[PDB]
Ligand binder design. Structure first.
Ligand SMILES: [Fe+2]
Length: 676
């Protein structure tokens, strides 16, 4: 893979490994020294092939001094062969070895100009050559990466209508590599379900009819779900360790809108305390779907009415310290057509009440927990990073690995999935616009504090491991949060000698300010910082960014097939309204309320496709793109990787004693960024 060209500097040029990384176009290189610039040098005609390392001897007509910049210019040979340049290194006549990180796609359209890889704040740059490069880099970034309002009240996102319109630097490696249209359909073939793809008016004949399809495609967890989804324990388990474990709260007072009494739930209580006494002891929990109240249901199929609820589910920590459901009201305002269902009800009344809660959990999961609170948030940070932090800045070098492919996957989603008449409308009862309404309503509670994982856990009253022992999302989340916090605090400490340097960093300030003003729409109640004035505040902010993009996304994304493939445990839609009376519903009715065959197919393809890892996925703390080249930061990265490996072992030992292992937050399964 290594080609040495001999006719002085030795210039090493490293081409990417991605499929189309290579180029046959003319490549010119110049060196900018403090004492002068070199000539433009055509690097020996030929092809920089995928994965290539080419070395060239380059003799200069004059002494240049310390090399400050390297300039690359791609000129056309034949047609446009985009080029992925990983890095350039220099061995100088004076014997020094200088690395210039790039990690960028180079189209013929503009010269690329690189600093050496030592990280620099603006205050480090005092000579004109460097100040001009830095300022021009930011001017160009701010023309190429612009903010846009895709839907009213949303966090602002990238100003591009489709993926092909993005700057090449932030596109996927290919145009059809990661594609919702192609991958959802590919999923339905691999899952063997393609004959039913568009059968949107046909119910399953019974549970057995769907089981026949499911058993061929189940995995370990989803097979357990199929066998156990009717159990109260399995239903309650998911609020702590399922796909959406972020909603449950410790109840400190029973809400007036839920007129439940001790007599109603006395059979569930196990301590000879009244319900009001259980509340006060900390044994009562609540999941409250107020956000779904008044969301429009999908009306895009006139032959299929679809329906949403907005339930309140009351839960109890029993004598085994397991949290189990004790009461379910399917809508927000109580009354005689909004019954409080109970585990003492007729079998299928209580089962259906639980299905409605699971369906509601799925809706909030897809649109709020996952899309808004990890995808759109991560994209806000990535756009702000590109607009305001030059590539030589240490926070750019730190964060660029954690926003990889984020704008690309979100733009594909707005292009194909969640746009009007996109794929999301096919199976989901919030399709057709209710999902946009939910985002608008959740925005008003997307706060900074809600992204600070320890505080957010405490805000829900769920922090006590002694009182609430089987919350593995919490336990693993806290360890990973602290690992990132430790890593970011060290990086900050290397490059920022004190708080005044943080406060005076104009690019950092503009980064934070773009997130507040554009990303968060300038809402004071968001609690986002308008500026950052200390090293500790910066460390916490960078942890919010990285944790949201890696750990939080992984926890809520990669258990989607596990928990939602068995459709009764997570219906994407319901084809009858919630039951208004006890003693009526039958199992046959439930079958006809659950998704039709077509919606089931699209749902399974979607949760399968979205739960996949890539063959060379980058997991947390894997940084093959060496933006950082300096020894102190590389030692910080090594300590990060060691802290993470210790967490892997903690989780592995914990999981061996568990009925259902919880592994979404094992760091060896957490990708660096939102990329799917
Ligand atoms: Fe995702």
């Amino acid at each position: 893979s290594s080609h040495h060209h001999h006719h002085s500097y030795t210039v090493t040029v490293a081409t990417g490994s991605q499929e189309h990384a290579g180029t046959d176009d003319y490549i010119y290189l110049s060196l900018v020294g403090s004492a002068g610039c070199s000539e433009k040098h055509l690097l020996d005609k030929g092809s920089f092939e995928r994965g290539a390392v080419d070395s060239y001897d380059v003799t200069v007509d004059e002494e240049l001094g310390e090399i400050q910049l390297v300039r690359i210019e791609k000129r056309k040979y034949g047609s446009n062969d985009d080029w992925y340049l990983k890095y350039i290194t220099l061995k100088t006549p004076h014997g020094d070895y200088i690395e210039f990180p790039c990690y960028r796609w180079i189209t013929g359209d503009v010269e690329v100009v690189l600093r050496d890889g030592r990280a620099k704040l603006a205050r480090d740059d005092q000579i004109h050559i460097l100040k001009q490069h830095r300022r021009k880099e930011l001017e160009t970034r701010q023309k190429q990466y612009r903010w846009m309002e895709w839907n009213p009240g949303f966090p602002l996102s990238i100003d591009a209508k489709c993926h092909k319109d993005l700057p090449r630097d932030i596109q996927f490696d290919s145009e059809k590599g990661v594609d919702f249209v192609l991958n959802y359909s590919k999923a339905m073939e691999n899952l063997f379900i393609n004959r039913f793809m568009h059968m949107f008016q046909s119910s399953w004949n019974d549970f057995a009819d769907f089981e026949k399809i499911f058993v061929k495609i189940s995995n370990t967890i989803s097979e357990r779900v199929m066998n156990h989804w009717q159990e109260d324990l399995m239903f309650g388990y998911q609020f702590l360790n399922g796909a959406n474990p972020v909603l449950i709260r410790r109840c400190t007072e029973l809400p007036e809108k839920l007129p439940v009494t001790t007599e109603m739930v006395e059979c569930s209580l196990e301590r000879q305390l009244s319900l009001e006494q259980e509340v006060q002891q900390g044994n009562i929990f609540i999941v409250d779907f107020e956000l779904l109240d008044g969301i429009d249901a999908n009306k895009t199929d006139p032959c299929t009415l679809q329906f949403l609820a907005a339930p309140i589910c009351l839960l109890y920590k029993n004598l085994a310290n397991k949290i189990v459901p004790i009461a379910i009201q399917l809508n927000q305002i109580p009354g005689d057509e909004n019954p409080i269902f109970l585990p003492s009800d007729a079998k299928y009344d209580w089962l259906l009440a639980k299905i409605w809660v699971r369906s509601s959990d799925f809706h909030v999961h897809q649109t709020i927990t996952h899309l808004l609170r990890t995808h759109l948030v991560s994209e806000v940070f990535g756009i702000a990073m590109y607009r305001q932090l030059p590539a030589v800045h240490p926070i750019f070098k730190l964060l660029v690995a954690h926003v990889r492919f984020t704008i690309a996957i979100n733009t594909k989603a707005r292009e194909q999935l969640i746009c009007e008449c996109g794929l999301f409308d096919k199976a989901n009862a919030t399709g057709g616009g209710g999902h946009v309404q939910m985002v608008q309503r959740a925005m008003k509670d997307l706060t900074y504090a809600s992204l600070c994982f320890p505080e957010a856990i405490k805000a829900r009253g769920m922090e006590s491991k002694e009182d609430i022992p089987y919350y593995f999302y919490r336990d693993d989340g806290l360890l990973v949060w602290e690992a990132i916090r430790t890593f970011t605090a060290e990086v900050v400490d290397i490059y920022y000698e004190g708080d005044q340097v943080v406060e005076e960093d104009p690019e950092l300030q503009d980064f934070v300010n773009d997130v507040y003003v554009y990303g968060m729409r300038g809402r004071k109640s968001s609690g986002f910082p308008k500026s950052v004035k200390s090293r500790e505040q910066l460390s916490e902010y960078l942890t919010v960014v990285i944790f949201t993009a890696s750990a939080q996304h992984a926890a809520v994304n990669f258990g989607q097939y596990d928990w939602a493939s068995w459709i009764p445990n997570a219906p994407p839609t319901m084809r009858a309204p919630p039951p208004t009376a006890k003693g009526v519903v039958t199992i046959e009715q439930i079958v006809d309320t659950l998704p039709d065959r077509g919606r089931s197919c699209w749902h399974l393809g979607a949760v399968w496709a979205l739960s996949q890892f890539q063959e060379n996925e980058l997991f947390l703390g894997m940084y093959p793109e060496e933006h950082f080249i300096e020894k102190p930061v590389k030692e910080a990265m090594a300590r990060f990787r060691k802290n993470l490996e210790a967490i892997v072992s903690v989780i592995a030992e914990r999981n061996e004693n568990l009925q259902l292992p919880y592994y979404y937050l094992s760091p060896d399964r957490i990708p660096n960024s939102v990329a799917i």
